[PDB]
Subunit: 112 residues, 2 copies
Amino acid sequence: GQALQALKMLKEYLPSSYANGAKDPIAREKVHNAATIAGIAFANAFLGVCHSMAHKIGAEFHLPHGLANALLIANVVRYNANDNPTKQTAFSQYDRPQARRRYAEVADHLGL
Amino acid sequence: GQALQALKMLKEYLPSSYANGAKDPIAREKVHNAATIAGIAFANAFLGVCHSMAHKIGAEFHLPHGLANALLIANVVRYNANDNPTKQTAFSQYDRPQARRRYAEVADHLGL
């Protein structure tokens, strides 16, 4: 619920707050709350492989968190961009039918 | 977030659980969780006029809760079905721009 909420609500206020601030004391607190909601979200759902992997890239090259992973996300979902490679997957058809569908739900859920 | 979640997720499992149970030990716990999520929701957002009003209808005629209001919701939103009656509204254009839009967001958000 609130993961979807934060994702939906961020797409408008990122460009504004990035361009505008503090001239826009609207988007800034909005994205602040959105980040807090994200923290609510993965407080129970653990992180993805990209996250610790970016921990690492930041680790050796002193790169800050937050953008190191931001350089990765793309290929990451392309790794998830799979129809049915049953090479190493475990218990696939139990609770997680297919990530692709989930992503598409996100897409149309933005109306993208 | 989770209000939208419960609303979205209920529309499928109500007809099934109503028709099927206990033959369907899927929809029943699903709607159970949905109700719990609803309780999460209005735990901070207070009730609507229909709710206490249905409290009353149940009160005099010994009618059970849950269906008394269920006989009302229709006209209720038709009461909210207003473009701009500034007859008794207070502080309208502050945080709540228009309920109609919110309802339409629900509609397309179901894809209705």
